[PDB]
């Protein structure tokens, strides 16, 4: 209510089935947590570092296969005036693993429908912090060291309005838009 | 009800029966994740490369069969006055795998019904994103080679209304409408 | 009532089963009490130390294993005009453990429910406090010996409105935002 | 009502199962009472002595071992304008103890539901005095001789309005805040 | 009515089971009515002797073992402007034994729910009347003698507003506060 | 109603069973009936000799093993302006023997619930007749017997206001409070 927003077998709408019933089999446990590759991390201009959201259903793929796992709604989508929110639940192998919230920015009114599935991958990307998955996103040792020997600090100009700004890019990465 | 618009054996409007239950066997795994050809990937003049729908509803017809897939309306159609969307689930082998919405842009009154399927096209398009297929296309070092190797940045004229500027397109591609 | 404050098979909702009902197997409980690693301790600049939430979920996946266990909402989220807070149990082997309340600060309207999932990491740190897991951070013998042999306080300049103030951090650690 | 507050298989919010059913077996009974070393027993400046609460949990996990108890709520959260409250009760082998009520003080509106916490930790050091855990922190023979033995009356001067105090402190503890 | 106040398998709340059905064993039977140490026995100032609860609860444990007994609340806690009260059962092995109204003080609003604890301590030091426990600490003769061996009555100066007068002490126990 | 007093398997509260139905087996009619010391029978100083409740407690213990009997209410607990009452039944072995009506005497408005436990005692004792506990203390001829070789009329001074009166006491007694 205090968002300022209006709502746009087994019944995964509501059902808590299998939630931390039994673990997984071994292999599976194996590939979870494969440490992941350096060169696919990237870093918002702000010094924020992440991964793909493609990487994550590769992964989760790799793991349980296509068609072992999903993704569910649980609530009805919140529309804010300047973001959208719902929340998702993970069903791996017919068991429930977790449920979160994803965000989205939209900007115009045209936007809305199209950002409703960007949430739906942030909720992917924040459930899967469950299992394990792409852990050391969340070290700050791990991030500190990526940011100092994978990404560099550099001061470029601001072409839409002609300003000067510093942000943060990878190395073997040039400066995209709105900069130079 | 924020968006400016108004709606136009298992009942798989509203069941989630199979959803993430049992993964499928290995050769479906193995057609599922073929590398995409760089041939038939496409990009828009905005600068965004993608893969047309008819190739998705081939890989899926490849890996699963005819008849052994398809698309079921989750929700209403809901038009707004720019656009058109609905939601869609995708159904492989009696079980459900996905939900998304899907978008298109309509510019004239008589344009809605031929907008309404372009929507189904773009929700399978959103749900193929769940089994793996173009996985590439959302990978961005994927995509940041593409377009150094397959694409150029072209000074051109409109000629609707005799303006200059610069778009995208394929090395091996014309200049199209409505450009000269 | 009080809190300035408006809401946003076993029903684990309400269900209290398994509570306290049959203790773990060995190796769980030798694993549950591996003493925690000074390195990944971390200390707030107000001089109060802590441990990552991702350690967390890395030694539940650990000791329970993926799938294993599993966080449940246990009541509506209370939104009060400056922070977010939410009611979480944990259930592990299908068996509900603890419940506890997760805190989180929120400063903008579009930041609640980027919010609404730190206190969810917030609830799985409190919870974990009963199955025994970091139990130095709560000894106050263990924090004034780390903070005397792995922690320094230094004098240090705050560059947003140039006052001095003086802080706690990690030896090892530099001077971070918002301060020189 | 006359607090000047409002609130904020088995049932275990109302089920009284077991109470007092059959004792526990030998070990149990053995190290339920292992005697308390005097090295982590602390004292307020009041001169009032006291147990970390992490201790409780770390000997009740060395009991019963882990999953083998839980706190359980047994009324709603009473939040009095200067304190918080709620009565808890203890469960062990799935088998109900003893139920109390615990404290905690918050200063703040932002500090409710840090607190609510705190009340859950005092709850559980209260009903572990029924278990006979840390038996002679209510000894006051025990309490005269640790007093004399282990703690000194200091004069120390408080900083914050500079005034001057006399409490009681640990021979080998330095003076903390809010003091010199 | 009349008190100035308001109130704050077997279902122990109401039921009345096992009340004097069956006697114990015999061994519990001799360690019910072991004879109490008299250094462990303290007076008021006033000249009262009594037993600390925590011998009680001590006491308890030994006969019955730890999960053998417990305190079942039977009323509605009652609080009075000056003093709070509650009735609280004794059930031990399963069986009912008494039920006693426990009796504390408090002096400040923010005292009530620290006294309706020792409520409780009080009333299972009134209950364990019935099992014999402390039986000595109601015999005339046994008062009389351990006043005249073990406590002297000793003139003493009120620090707090300076007044003489006289109160009860024991012989090895030094002036406490309020007094020199 | 013209008290001017307001009220404050087997349901024991209201159930008659057992009433006299059968006689206890023969070592328990031998040690109901033990003849009691003399050295343990006091005496209010207005010439009145009673028997301390413990010693029927220790006489019920003895005779019925802890655990063997108790004490239910009866009824609900009636307040007079000046003195409290209840009701209360005795129980052993599982069979009712005999109600009472129990008084206490309370002089301030913090005292009912102090008293309210006395008149219990007062209903044990008053109990008791029915099992011939302590009859001699109801036998004229040892009354005066025994007031004639144990107790003494002694001349003593009121030391509170001042005043001469004759009272009774033991001849191994000294005055007590509020006398000389």
């Given at each position: 209510?205090?968002?300022?927003?209006?709502?746009?077998?087994?019944?995964?709408?509501?059902?808590?089935?299998?939630?931390?019933?039994?673990?997984?089999?071994?292999?599976?446990?194996?590939?979870?947590?494969?440490?992941?590759?350096?060169?696919?991390?990237?870093?918002?201009?702000?010094?924020?570092?992440?991964?793909?959201?493609?990487?994550?259903?590769?992964?989760?793929?790799?793991?349980?296969?296509?068609?072992?796992?999903?993704?569910?709604?649980?609530?009805?989508?919140?529309?804010?005036?300047?973001?959208?929110?719902?929340?998702?639940?993970?069903?791996?192998?017919?068991?429930?693993?977790?449920?979160?919230?994803?965000?989205?920015?939209?900007?115009?009114?045209?936007?809305?429908?199209?950002?409703?599935?960007?949430?739906?991958?942030?909720?992917?990307?924040?459930?899967?912090?469950?299992?394990?998955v792409?852990?050391?996103?969340?070290?700050?040792?791990?991030?500190k060291?990526?940011?100092?020997?994978?990404?560099?600090?550099?001061?470029?100009?601001?072409?839409?309005?002609?300003?000067?700004?510093?942000?943060?890019?990878?190395?073997?990465?040039?400066?995209?838009?709105?900069?130079?």
């Open positions: 209510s205090k968002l300022g927003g209006t709502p746009l077998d087994i019944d995964w709408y509501t059902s808590w089935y299998g939630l931390g019933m039994k673990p997984f089999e071994a292999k599976v446990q194996k590939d979870l947590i494969e440490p992941l590759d350096p060169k696919d991390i990237e870093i918002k201009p702000d010094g924020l570092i992440y991964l793909p959201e493609i990487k994550y259903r590769r992964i989760l793929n790799k793991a349980f296969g296509a068609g072992g796992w999903g993704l569910v709604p649980r609530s009805q989508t919140i529309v804010t005036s300047k973001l959208v929110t719902r929340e998702y639940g993970l069903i791996c192998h017919g068991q429930l693993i977790s449920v979160a919230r994803g965000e989205q920015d939209y900007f115009n009114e045209a936007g809305i429908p199209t950002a409703t599935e960007g949430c739906k991958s942030n909720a992917l990307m924040r459930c899967c912090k469950d299992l394990g792409g852990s050391e996103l969340w070290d700050p040792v791990f991030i060291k990526f940011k100092v020997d994978h990404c560099t600090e550099k001061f470029v100009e601001h072409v839409t309005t002609k300003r000067k700004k510093k942000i943060w890019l990878r190395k073997d990465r040039q400066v995209e838009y709105p900069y130079k």
